[PDB]
Amino acid sequence: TMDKSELVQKAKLAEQAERYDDMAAAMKAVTEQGHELSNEERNLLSVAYKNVVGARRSSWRVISSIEQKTERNEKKQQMGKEYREKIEAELQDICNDVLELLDKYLIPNATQPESKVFYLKMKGDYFRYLSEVASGDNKQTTVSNSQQAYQEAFEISKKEMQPTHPIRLGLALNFSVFYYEILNSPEKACSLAKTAFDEAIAELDTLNEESYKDSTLIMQLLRDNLTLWTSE
Amino acid sequence: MTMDKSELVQKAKLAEQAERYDDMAAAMKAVTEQGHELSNEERNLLSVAYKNVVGARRSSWRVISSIEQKTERNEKKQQMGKEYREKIEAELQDICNDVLELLDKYLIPNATQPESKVFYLKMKGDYFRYLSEVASGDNKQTTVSNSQQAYQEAFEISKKEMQPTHPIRLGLALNFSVFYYEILNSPEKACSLAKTAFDEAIAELDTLNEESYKDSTLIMQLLRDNLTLWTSEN
């Protein structure tokens, strides 16, 4: 039963030591005390799970790729399948953990739009990661929950934050990638990405020093996707 | 659930590609525990797995230690760093202990070829040295001593079973001489070990093949290099 200061300091030590499971466990405990997280605490939570889930996603695609290679030995095929499944179950546990934190503590206790959008975007991301390894029927539910979360985030971000805000831009980035990669709709992905990019560059006066680099980084990622998707 | 050896090796290789080294180590641990001499592929997978598993904790340990020295004394920032280092130290001790048990229970006694036996003894030396980096004052001399003993025994076997120019033996001479200089702070003995190994190989240079000599001479050069470096220090 550590207090937040100690758990955050542990999270930061774990991050420097590249021990992200520890970092996630720390920030999960912080989150479970049921209080609104600071920007720093929220970033630490986000980075921890980004790394914890990202490692499985990378692993999952490495194994899925190896499964496509010609293989005549049945035991090796089974090992590939069972190892993929092992990773999927880990991925499912991680996402379920994240989505529970969001549903039980983070989203309902959020009193400021910035956080609400951040957490809803997160809900969208983690339901998307679930959907990538989902079995069918659960596949449609997860894809649909992802879309609903992004959509809710998006509507709030348009009312409550500047078009150049990193969270709003990041949401447009991920939501547009969702449309292209998960929903297989270039038309929806391009509409959203173009809208968010155009809205940003129409309001360069909303940029600020503190987030200038994050803003312009994500704006360029949006432009890059648009160019790629328009080339098809 | 309950995998055979073909399954565990394939899992290890899949784990390696997926960068899931704990899984890779777990798989090759189970293979080793079946009690048979490992093939070269199997031995390589085991070695690489544990190298990565222990490597991660050693890197983590060094990072936390640096942070620790930078911090002020009256702070809790010292306390949390102390407990996190100790958590990493215990994980390290556990990994090393697992490897050492594998080596003494299965790998070393079942080795029927001198190359394998020497490989496993050199590992034993390595994992004792890793333990010695995080061992407390009292415990530290024993670990360094067990490390020395393992390297020694590997080196002795190489002297009996391999030619002076054999790269495994030369590689053992190099590691062993540097161990004396760096860990035991015994530069005179370090020079003596280097010189002996270098001289013994030189005496048999003429027997090497023209197309492969570099496999030996590259290591002999390093032995020569250390000898010059060390004997220039008054």
How many other C-beta atoms lie within 10 A of the C-beta of residue A84? 21
Task: In whole angstroms, give the CA distance from residue B18 to residue A202.
Answer: 44
Whether residue A6 and residue B67 make contact (CB cut-off 8 A), yes or no, is no
Closest CA to A154 of A109, A183, A123, A190: A123
Under DSSP, the state recorded for A164 is T
**The amino acid at A140:** Q
**CA-to-CA dists, residue A46 to A15, A21, A39, A163, angstroms:** 12, 13, 10, 22
Six-digit token pair at B163?
Answer: 């030619």
Whether residue A17 and residue B64 make contact (CB cut-off 8 A), yes or no, is yes
Half-sphere exposure of B114 (CA within 13 A, CB side): 15
Closest CA to B100 of B81, B78, B121: B121
Q: Delimit the domains of chain B by residue range.
A: 2-234
Task: In whole angstroms, give the CA distance from residue A55 to residue B21.
Answer: 12
Six-digit token pair at B203?
Answer: 């005496």
Q: Which of residues 24-83 of B touch A (CB under 8 A)?
A: 56, 59-60, 63-64, 67, 76-77, 80-81
Superfamily holding B2-234: 14-3-3 domain (1.20.190.20)
**CA-to-CA dists, residue B186 to B90, B92, B192, angstroms:** 30, 28, 10
For chain A, the first-to-last Cα distance in angstroms comes to 53
How many other C-beta atoms lie within 10 A of the C-beta of residue A198? 12
Residue-wise DSSP of B118-168? HHHHHHHHHHHHHHHHS--HHHHHHHHHHHHHHHHHHHHHHHHHS-TT-HH
For chain B, the first-to-last Cα distance in angstroms comes to 62
Classify domain A1-232 by CATH number: 1.20.190.20
Q: How many CB pairs under 8 A join A and B?
A: 58
Whether residue B76 and residue A6 make contact (CB cut-off 8 A), yes or no, is yes
Question: Which residues of chain A have a CB within 8 Å of the CB of B10?
Answer: 75-76, 79-80
Task: In whole angstroms, give the CA distance from residue A121 to residue A148.
Answer: 10
Under DSSP, the state recorded for A134 is -
Whether residue A63 and residue B18 make contact (CB cut-off 8 A), yes or no, is yes
Provide the resolution (angstroms): 2.2
Task: In whole angstroms, give the CA distance from residue B128 to residue B150.
Answer: 9
Residue-wise DSSP of chain B? ----HHHHHHHHHHHHHTT-HHHHHHHHHHHHTT-SPPPHHHHHHHHHHHHHHHHHHHHHHHHHHHHHHHS-TTSHHHHHHHHHHHHHHHHHHHHHHHHHHHIIIIIHHH--SHHHHHHHHHHHHHHHHHHHHS--HHHHHHHHHHHHHHHHHHHHHHHHHS-TT-HHHHHHHHHHHHHHHHTS--HHHHHHHHHHHHHHHHTTGGGS-TTTTHHHHHHHHHHHHHHHHHHT--
Six-digit token pair at A94?
Answer: 């991680």
- The experimental method, as deposited, was X-ray
Interface test with A, best of B20, B64, B86 (most A CBs within 10 A): B20
Six-digit token pair at B57?
Answer: 């904790």
Report whether B95 contacts B61 (CB < 8 A).
no
Under DSSP, the state recorded for A161 is S
